[PDB]
Amino acid sequence: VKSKGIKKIVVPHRPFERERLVSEMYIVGKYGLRNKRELWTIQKMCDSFKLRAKDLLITPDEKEFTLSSRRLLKKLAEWGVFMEDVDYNNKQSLTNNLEKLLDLAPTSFLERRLQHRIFDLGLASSVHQARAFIHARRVKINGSVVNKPGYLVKDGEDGFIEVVESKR
């Protein structure tokens, strides 16, 4: 049926391709994700930014290039993903940095997720018990609880994250 809402995953063309199976298995294992759908969701997000960079570099006009480059780079800096010293009002560096985006990887999006941040900031003994503190309300940000492990943490929120003891 045709109805509201987008679809956020793309199914792989070959269901039993051995190099894909092994490399996916590793990354789910290491990062403590629920199933293959969590991973595929991040992959589509990553692809979208790569497409924008491609389009910008090949555009003929200057007005669009100067306008939309800035927006793309600023956004990815705020998420804490693309960390480099982009200088504005300088055409060459904008081109240089756009080229550096083109080999961005899903690992970089994964490491901004709250489940990984909690463990990485040494507030939990494993990526597993980090998830188990996001459930059951033990994790709090700016004085308010966050129930969802997929919460992507912007650059500089790290000062305000906290854990509290269990209710028992």
Partner: protein, 260 residues
């Protein structure tokens, strides 16, 4: 259809009214009256949105049953009465006065004025005719009619009206170097000064304009109202004086020019 249309679906109503798509299926169908349906707004949208003084239909009723609201000097009692551009709105209790103008985006907006500006409006001249008993007449854009005005006023000019006497006060014509306001098109709500006019036969005349902060733009005469005797404007315009910026210009102005 067997007869005249009564309803109006919310997705079909003018983009100038600026009403939220999701809340309900209908919108108010303006009553017949002074301006066209595409160039005016019903009064009940003004009181609930543009200038918030009611929040429910029971309150909208009460305000007009008590006879509070005055438009062009007459008290109004139809909630679906159309108001248009250059159209003084007032509440005599608390002595408030407003004109109706466009945002730079082309939406409608109310602008607060003094009791001086509240005394006059502007319209455009559409036809001249002589009537039974050899009486000369003249007519205007918003369905206005005038008896024994100055004969020299020509079709296409713009005239200033005294609201208390309902007579014409001043006249201005379409010439190089006069101030213009933009009613319809790509550049609604812009304000500028005439560079040059190119005359066409049996078809609209093309007018070329310079903006106050340098930009040239041209449009057809059918979308322009002339809003001053020569140099400078009659009516007081908005908090921002009708300058429109591209997203590109907004970026340059925010983060600085691209250096060599």
């Amino acid at each position: 259809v067997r007869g005249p249309r009564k309803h109006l679906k919310r997705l079909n109503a003018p983009k100038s009214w600026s009403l939220d798509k999701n809340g309900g299926v209908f919108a108010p169908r303006t009553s017949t009256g002074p301006h066209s349906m595409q160039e005016s707004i019903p009064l009940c949208l003004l009181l609930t949105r543009i200038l918030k003084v009611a929040s429910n239909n029971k309150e909208i009723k009460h305000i007009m049953k008590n006879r509070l609201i005055t438009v062009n000097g007459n008290i109004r009692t139809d909630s679906r009465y159309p108001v248009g551009i250059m159209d003084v709105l007032s509440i005599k209790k608390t002595n408030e006065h407003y004109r109706l103008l466009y945002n730079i985006a082309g939406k409608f907006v109310l602008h607060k004025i003094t009791e001086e500006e509240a005394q006059y409006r502007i319209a455009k001249v559409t036809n001249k005719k002589v009537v039974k008993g050899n009486i000369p007449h003249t007519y205007t854009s918003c369905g206005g009619s005038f008896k024994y005005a100055d004969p020299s006023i020509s079709i296409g000019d713009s005239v200033k009206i005294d609201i208390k006497t309902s007579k014409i006060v001043e006249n201005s014509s379409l010439e190089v170097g006069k101030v213009v306001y933009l009613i319809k098109g790509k550049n609604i709500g812009c304000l500028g000064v005439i560079t040059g006019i190119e005359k066409r036969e049996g078809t609209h005349d093309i007018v070329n304009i310079v903006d106050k902060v340098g930009r040239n733009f041209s449009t057809i005469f059918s979308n322009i109202l002339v809003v001053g005797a020569d140099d400078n404007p009659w009516v007081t315009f908005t908090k921002d004086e009708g300058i429109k910026y591209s997203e590109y210009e907004q970026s340059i102005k925010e983060y600085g020019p691209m250096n060599e």
